[PDB]
Amino acid sequence: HALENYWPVMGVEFSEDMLDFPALFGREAPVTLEIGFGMGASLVAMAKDRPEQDFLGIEVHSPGVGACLASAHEEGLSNLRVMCHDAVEVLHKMIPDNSLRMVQLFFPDPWHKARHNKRRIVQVPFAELVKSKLQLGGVFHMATDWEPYAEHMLEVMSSIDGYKNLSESNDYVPRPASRPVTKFEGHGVWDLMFERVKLE
Ligand SMILES: Nc1ncnc2c1ncn2[C@@H]1O[C@H](CSCC[C@H](N)C(=O)O)[C@@H](O)[C@H]1O
């Protein structure tokens, strides 16, 4: 019942119009986007802990959207909105340039098989697209539990002018407060965080 009940309140329909964040959230505040939020546990925890900030989630899996809405309602959140649509299209059509404080991409589909390597969302064009939507100093934070994907992510991100690795060892970062531990959580999870800086 969560979708029918709470989609009218917290859902955002896809359109070819750029989002007005002040209009959407009813105030001027930092916006964090989580792509592929799944059941939304991280996103709800994030929004609950940061009532002074605003949060957008995008997830193609509609039961995940429903679960996220149910949890957000259970926590009485007013600072969370969700979409059920391909995030790439939302980024292109609805997210203004230079507008986001942070983009989170946690455990994106790992596509273990080499035959599926191109299905992995972290590729140069996607990473460039995300970059264009971050404010300077904004961060793209991704995490994976598959080392081949982690290495691919690092290669992609390291190749892009305008991304600065926040890793003190030029690869991975420790898990920040802004990502929750997994039930099973080196220790087998890789976090990557890159800040947007001016083109060199
Ligand atoms: N293009 C896209 N747009 C929005 N969501 C996407 C997407 N491609 C994959 N996803 C979603 O990304 C999620 C990755 S599974 C990880 C889910 C969640 N972050 C967690 O850690 O539990 C899936 O739910 C999948 O539906």
Swiss-Prot record:
Binding site for substrate: 113, 145, 182-185
Active site residues per record: 109
Residues annotated for S-adenosyl-L-methionine binding in this entry: 34, 59, 86, 109
Residue numbers spanned by region Interaction with RNA: 115-120
Effect of residue 116 to A: Reduces catalytic activity over 10-fold
Catalytic activity: guanosine(46) in tRNA + S-adenosyl-L-methionine = N(7)-methylguanosine(46) in tRNA + S-adenosyl-L-homocysteine
Pathway of action: tRNA modification; N(7)-methylguanine-tRNA biosynthesis
Alphabetized GO MF terms: tRNA (guanine(46)-N7)-methyltransferase activity
A GO biological process held by the record: tRNA (guanine-N7)-methylation
Protein function: Catalyzes the formation of N(7)-methylguanine at position 46 (m7G46) in tRNA.
Official protein name in the record: tRNA (guanine-N(7)-)-methyltransferase
